[PDB]
Amino acid sequence: TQTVLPFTGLNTPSGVAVDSAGTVYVTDHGNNRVVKLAAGSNTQTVLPFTGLNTPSGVAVDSAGTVYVTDHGNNRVVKLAAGSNTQTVLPFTGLNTPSGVAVDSAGTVYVTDHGNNRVVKLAAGSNTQTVLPFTGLNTPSGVAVDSAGTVYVTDHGNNRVVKLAAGSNTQTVLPFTGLNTPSGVAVDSAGTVYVTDHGNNRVVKLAAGSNTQTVLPFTGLNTPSGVAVDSAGTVYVTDHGNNRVVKLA
Numbered sequence: 001t002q003t004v005l006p007f008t009g010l011n012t013p014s015g016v017a018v019d020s021a022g023t024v025y026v027t028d029h030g031n032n033r034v035v036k037l038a039a040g041s042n043t044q045t046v047l048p049f050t051g052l053n054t055p056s057g058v059a060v061d062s063a064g065t066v067y068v069t070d071h072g073n074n075r076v077v078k079l080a081a082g083s084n085t086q087t088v089l090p091f092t093g094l095n096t097p098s099g100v101a102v103d104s105a106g107t108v109y110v111t112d113h114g115n116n117r118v119v120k121l122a123a124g125s126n127t128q129t130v131l132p133f134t135g136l137n138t139p140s141g142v143a144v145d146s147a148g149t150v151y152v153t154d155h156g157n158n159r160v161v162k163l164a165a166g167s168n169t170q171t172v173l174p175f176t177g178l179n180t181p182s183g184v185a186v187d188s189a190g191t192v193y194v195t196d197h198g199n200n201r202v203v204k205l206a207a208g209s210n211t212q213t214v215l216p217f218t219g220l221n222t223p224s225g226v227a228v229d230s231a232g233t234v235y236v237t238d239h240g241n242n243r244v245v246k247l248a
Contacts, residue, residue, distance in 0.1 A: 002217055005235075005244040006042045007035060015057040015099070015183065016225040016237045016244060019064065024235055026244055027058045027068060027225070034058055034068055048084045049077065057099040057142075057225070059108075067108060069097035076100055076110055089121060091128060099142040099153070099183075109150060111139040118142060118152055131163055133170050141184035141195070141226070151192055153184045160184060160194050174210045175203060183226035183237070193234055195226045202226055202236050215247060 007013075011030030018024050022039035025047075032055060034047045049055075053072025060066050064081035067089075076089045076097050091097070095114025102108050106123030109131075118131045118139060133139075137156025144150050148165035151173075158181065160173045179198030186192050190207030193215075200223065202215045217223075221240030228234050235246045 002245045002247045005037060005246060007037060007044050007244055010035070010242045010244075013237045013239060013242065013244065014055065014224050015059075015069075016227045016235050017058045017060050018227045018229040018233075018235055019060045020062070020230065022229055022233075023060075024227075024244065024246075025058050025060055025066065026237060027055045029055055034066065047079060048086075049079055050086060052077075057097070057111075059100045059102045061102045061106060062104060065102075067100045067102055069100050069110065071096050076108065090126060091119060091121060094119075098138075098140040101142045101144045101150075103144045103148060104146060107144075109142050109144055111142045111152060113138055113140065118150065120150075132168055133161060133163060136161070140182055143184045143186045143192075145186045145190060146188060147190075149186075149190075151184050151186055153181050153194060155181060160192065162192075173205055175205060175212055178203070182224045185226045185228045185234075187228045187232060188230060191228075193226050193228055195223045195236060197223055197239075202234065204234075217245060217247060220245070 010028045014029035015027040025036045032052045035044045055068045057069040066079045097110045098113040099111040109120045116136045119128045121128045140155040141153035150163045158178045161170045182197040183195040193204045200220045205212045224239035225237040
């Protein structure tokens, strides 16, 4: 049984993320803002980002710092926890950052939609590293697990790829029948979840498995972002329906 979250006033929402407290963050892309809801509350909070233009992905780190990708201004911005200071991360050469993820060490991973690459920047660094994915076509969703394995939605090629921590060669995950997929997420068991945008469904694949499961969402309409919390609850931005839904 899915539950609709009590967000209000969303338009064409994009990324979703969930922090360790169960607080859910949504990129309300059509309104150039990020909104959050705490577990159990009915009051949503608009975050103090300024100057966003066509945001898409959102991530939240351990300390509560929020990262958002911004298509108009072609940048990734950080909203500092507490101070609420907004800074632009010093990525270089982006053409339209799509997805963002942050790992336990504060390293920020971004999909570079126009340049068919994934780039990462450690905390406070002026060195960005291009990850050795190959043959991507308009990558969008990205996620990183506690091991450092990176998962990328290769949107143009209707597939999901991973680069395991330690490896130099990507693996194509054995998802089947995806169509223009968008968001991706990974839980602490290594189960991967993907928004199969073009077939209105969310699909999941347990670690080391070859058999995917279709999650029992209903009435999704062109879904976009996906996230999973520490209890296994899956959150999907139901983009075409201007809402966010969750499934325990």
